[PDB]
RNA sequence: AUGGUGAA
RNA sequence: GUUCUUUGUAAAGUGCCUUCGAAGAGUCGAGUUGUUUGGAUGCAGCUCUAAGUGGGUGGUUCCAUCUAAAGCUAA
RNA sequence: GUUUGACCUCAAAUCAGGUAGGAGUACCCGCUGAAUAUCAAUAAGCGGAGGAAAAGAAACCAACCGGGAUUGCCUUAGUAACGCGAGUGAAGCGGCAAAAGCUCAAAUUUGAAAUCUGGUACCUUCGGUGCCCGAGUUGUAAUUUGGAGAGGG
């Protein structure tokens, strides 16, 4: 059997599934040549003329019940960066993505179970964890690389479910939907919020 | 050791003024192929009462042309020109023509202020900032002719 | 063998340009091919085969990928019962913990 | 090093200071009320231009880091230690003067300031200089929570709202190398870029 | 134009200058094999009044030869056979000594485009200019021939062996004369 | 004489 | 013949006036050595190497005719 | 800068788009080539093309009241000339067949490298267009090839 390092090298695993497995990233890095080039040649504007994975997420997700498998941890690492050398836009993007889940879920307030704990507060629906609102005191690379997949694959699955603005600057099928309902809550500073008084 | 015609190179314009008159001439850099393009699709598409332009000039010929008509002002000549012998005789003509010249190493250097990827020799003619392009000319000589 | 060589001629600078064939109008007058490129761009455009920039611009501005197909913790609450909680003494053979707080807010 | 620098370092710091005298002087002149002798008597804030309503109003500061080749003269040097602003009160009649002066030097919602407090979270602590992060609520309450502060919250709360803590919390609280990081950088210079009289510019 | 310069500056080809750059050149060519391609002509004057352009389809060689079927002929035919797929259309001396005497010739690809397209430069493509130095049809060729006017080239005017065989043949018309 | 054949 | 297009202050020609007005160098040439011619020419190794109102080919003071050392082209 | 870029040079890729060998050979072109003058620029050998090949529009022929691309025939002519011995042996003019002139180097498009190869999507597909990539400034297009030619009115 072909090893890890020589696969990948040619490119312990089956060479019948790997071999035929071989067939933009790579051409990409012609463009830091280019950039080089314009920057040797002292003028920016044919620098910015050079300036201006679905197909992975169907195989490895042919239908979208197949997802639950890996939201585990496409979720927590959203949760992760959303509370988190990231750029801040891709902070900004992980956190929405997160805001607009639990709006869809608060939506249909599908959840089951919670269990507030040291790391988290955990949830139910598939479980998920989200890290308090608190500063979080490694390679960063496969970090950025997982974050960037796991929102590819979220932006299809909130695409799917929902098929199925002056707070920015503020901010029955169970017995959780059956209890509480009408009850209106009123949240002091520790339903209607204390905090926006302020 | 070699004929005097030869070895006036490698004696050249020291690094601050060198940087100085790169400085002065890109600003005069000419419109590249992009932005050239894009201007006269702009004008199309507008038409769809100008000032003369202004831009260095390179061309070996058109510069030997512009030179010995005393229009050429400071003239850029590359040292490492593998036919050595196409500007051996061009400090002798700007000495007879008086036309101020300076001998900048690199070619590639020379032609990267030109969208070129070399370029054996630049000039100027015209002007915006007369004052500058006078002091450097008189900041060359000094520097250059004066000494070797 | 590398003598000195003298600039006999050179030393006295040329008085009048050499060149001939007066200025043409061309130099006074705006160029005549950025004129032949505009009208060319222009029956481009009025052909319909090229687009403005600023068009362009406007130009420049999430589906069903699938569709139908056929293919834990671990008791660590924030006030848990002090029996989970582990003993200083264990503590340091431990080297996540069960801890005992007031609230949430604590 | 080249005389160059040293010379663009003198030049700068010379028009830089003539511009905070002017606008000392200025502000002198205008706590004595004797607008005769003075272009504008009133105050100006630009965001577009804004009068300086006496209205001690609050706004986040933030760093410029320039002009560089002005070095900071000991007024600003100062005032930055004052403020500790120096690494890269309120907007009161008596602190406008000394804003002012450090304006070239220097430039909100719940929303921005919730998430501010909560991700910077700056504690001193006690070795002695240790400011790591809001580790726990109860330090607050052990070190701030005889002013009635329970948790950071109530600082967040405190500093939004017109409240004490804003006073008290005083005494308790593209960027990148390499080729690729060039472009970003040359094209944020544009936004990167002043008359004594002129209202604070925003 | 500068060429009027470089066209006279090699006039005065036993010049200290020109004799310096030549012991330069042929040493520096010394280290590189017999036939190699040149990024550029040394005699840019000399190739363009030849009929070479600076456009893509043209290919500059440089070939040594030992000195002492002339050596410019030799080159040529190297050059042709080395260049199977390129056409030979001019030669010219670049550098001479005691052992070697080197030439640079220029080809023309007529299987590029821009060749094929060129108004100018298409006829190369017929296929009767196949190996033109093999058939003596280049400068030097024509030259080595004895082709040209006068009395000087009458008995080489146009053929050598052509002369031979029709003062040789026996025309006999259906009426005798 | 020209060009080839085999033969230690 | 039939039918759509031209266009763009686009490209040429005629006569006049006016200001300018480039020309293939290790090439021509001489020397020598091999070669061809019924031609003394040409071809070829090598020392040297030419000028721009210049150079080549022919005769009684020179007069007649072209502008080589690049190339394409059916009959 | 106890670094990072511009080129130039040199290698490689089961890279993409291309061409080269060889066969045939009566004729064509070049090299070589026997049995000091003669068989002989023949025989044989090698290399390179087509339906024809080569040559071709004079640094020509002539000494005339001049002709004006090259090529083939008659004539010039078995003459001039030579080896004056056996022998070799032209060419202008004249008549006929057929006729076509052109393209670069050379002096600035510099008020716009205006030029061209390749990739991509279409259409009316021996090609055209929008965009991109690369070559080009050590010169790609137009304007001039001595009959002159060029900037202007």
Redesign the interface.
Request: glycine share 4%; net charge positive.
């Given at each position: 059997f072909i090893t890890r390092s020589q696969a990948v090298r040619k490119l312990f695993y089956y060479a019948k599934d790997i071999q035929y497995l071989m067939h933009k990233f790579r051409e990409h890095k012609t463009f830091?040549r280019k950039?080089?080039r314009a920057?040797?040649?002292?003028?920016?504007?044919?620098?910015k003329?050079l300036?201006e994975l679905?197909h992975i997420?169907?195989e490895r997700?042919?239908?979208?019940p197949?997802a639950i498998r890996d939201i585990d941890d496409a979720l927590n690492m959203l949760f992760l960066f959303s509370n988190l050398?990231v750029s801040s836009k891709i902070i900004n993007d992980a956190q929405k993505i997160c805001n607009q889940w639990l709006a869809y879920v608060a939506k249909e307030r599908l959840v089951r179970k919670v269990?507030?704990?040291?790391?988290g507060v955990?949830y139910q629906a598939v479980?998920w964890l989200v890290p308090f609102?608190?500063?979080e005191?490694v390679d960063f690379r496969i970090m950025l690389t997982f974050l960037e997949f796991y929102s590819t694959l979220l932006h299809?699955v909130l695409?799917?479910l929902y098929?199925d603005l002056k707070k920015?600057?503020?901010?029955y099928d169970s017995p959780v939907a059956s209890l509480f309902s009408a009850f209106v809550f009123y949240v002091s500073?520790?339903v209607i919020s204390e905090?926006?008084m302020? | 050791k070699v004929p005097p015609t030869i070895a006036q190179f490698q004696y050249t314009l020291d690094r601050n003024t060198a940087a100085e008159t790169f400085k002065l001439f890109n600003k005069y850099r000419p419109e590249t192929a992009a932005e050239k393009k894009e201007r006269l699709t702009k004008e199309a598409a507008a038409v769809a009462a100008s000032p003369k332009p202004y831009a260095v000039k390179y061309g070996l010929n058109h510069v030997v042309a512009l030179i010995e008509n005393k229009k050429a002002k400071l003239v850029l000549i590359a040292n490492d020109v593998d036919p050595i012998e196409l500007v051996v005789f061009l400090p002798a003509l700007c000495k007879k023509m008086g036309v101020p010249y300076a001998i900048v190493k690199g070619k590639a250097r020379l032609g990267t202020l030109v969208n070129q990827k070399t370029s054996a020799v630049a000039a100027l003619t015209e002007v915006r900032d007369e004052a500058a392009l006078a002091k450097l000319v008189s900041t060359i000589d000094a520097n250059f002719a004066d000494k070797y | 063998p590398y003598e000195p060589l003298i600039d006999w001629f050179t030393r006295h600078e040329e008085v009048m340009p050499l060149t001939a064939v007066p200025e043409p109008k061309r130099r006074f007058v705006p160029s005549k091919n950025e004129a032949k490129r505009v009208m060319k761009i222009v029956r481009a455009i009025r052909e319909g085969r090229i687009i403005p920039p600023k068009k362009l611009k406007e130009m420049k501005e999430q589906y069903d990928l699938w569709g139908d197909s056929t293919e834990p913790t671990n008791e660590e609450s924030y006030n848990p019962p002090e029996e989970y909680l582990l003993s200083p003494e264990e503590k340091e053979a431990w080297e996540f913990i069960p801890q005992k707080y007031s609230a949430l807010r604590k | 090093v080249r005389a160059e620098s040293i010379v663009a370092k003198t030049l700068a710091t010379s028009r830089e200071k003539e511009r905070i005298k002017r606008v000392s002087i200025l502000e002198d002149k205008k706590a004595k009320n004797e607008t005769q002798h003075i272009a504008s008597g009133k105050d100006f804030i630009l965001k577009e231009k804004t009068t300086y309503d006496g209205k001690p109003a609050l706004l986040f500061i933030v760093r410029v880091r320039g002009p560089l080749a002005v070095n900071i003269p000991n007024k600003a040097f100062k005032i930055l230690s004052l403020l500790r602003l120096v690494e890269t009160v309120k907007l009161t009649k008596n602190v406008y003067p000394l804003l002012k002066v450090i304006a070239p030097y220097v430039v909100p919602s719940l929303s921005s300031i919730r998430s501010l407090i909560q991700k910077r979270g700056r504690i001193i602590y006690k070795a002695e200089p240790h400011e790591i992060v809001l580790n726990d609520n109860n330090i607050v309450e052990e070190q701030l929570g005889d002013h009635g502060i329970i948790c950071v919250e109530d600082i967040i709360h405190e500093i939004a709202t017109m409240g004490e803590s804003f006073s008290v919390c005083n005494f308790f609280l593209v960027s990148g190398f390499g080729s690729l990081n060039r472009l970003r950088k040359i094209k944020q210079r544009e936004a990167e870029s002043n008359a004594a009289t002129a209202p604070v510019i925003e | 134009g500068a060429y009027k310069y470089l066209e006279e500056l090699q006039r005065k080809k036993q010049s200290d200058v020109l004799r310096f750059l030549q012991r330069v050149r042929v040493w520096e060519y010394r280290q590189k094999n017999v036939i190699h391609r040149a990024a550029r002509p040394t005699r840019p004057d000399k190739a363009r009044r030849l009929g070479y352009k600076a456009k893509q389809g043209f290919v500059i060689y440089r070939v040594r030869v030992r000195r002492g079927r002339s050596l410019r002929a030799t080159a040529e035919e190297r050059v042709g056979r080395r260049a199977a797929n390129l056409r030979v259309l001019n030669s010219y001396w670049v550098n001479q000594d005691s052992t070697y005497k080197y030439f640079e010739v220029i080809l023309v690809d007529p299987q590029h485009k821009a060749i094929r397209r060129d108004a100018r430069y298409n006829w190369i493509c017929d296929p009767v200019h196949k190996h033109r130095e093999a058939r003596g049809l280049t400068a030097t060729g024509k030259k080595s021939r004895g082709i040209n006017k006068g009395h000087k080239f009458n008995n080489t005017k146009a053929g050598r062996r052509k002369t031979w065989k029709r003062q040789n043949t026996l025309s006999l018309w259906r009426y005798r004369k």
């Open positions: 830091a950039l080089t920057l040797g040649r002292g003028e920016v504007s044919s620098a003329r300036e679905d997420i169907k997700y042919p239908s979208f197949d050398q269990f507030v704990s040291i790391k955990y479980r609102k608190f500063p005191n299809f695409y799917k098929t920015d600057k503020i901010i500073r520790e905090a926006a302020d | - | - | - | -």
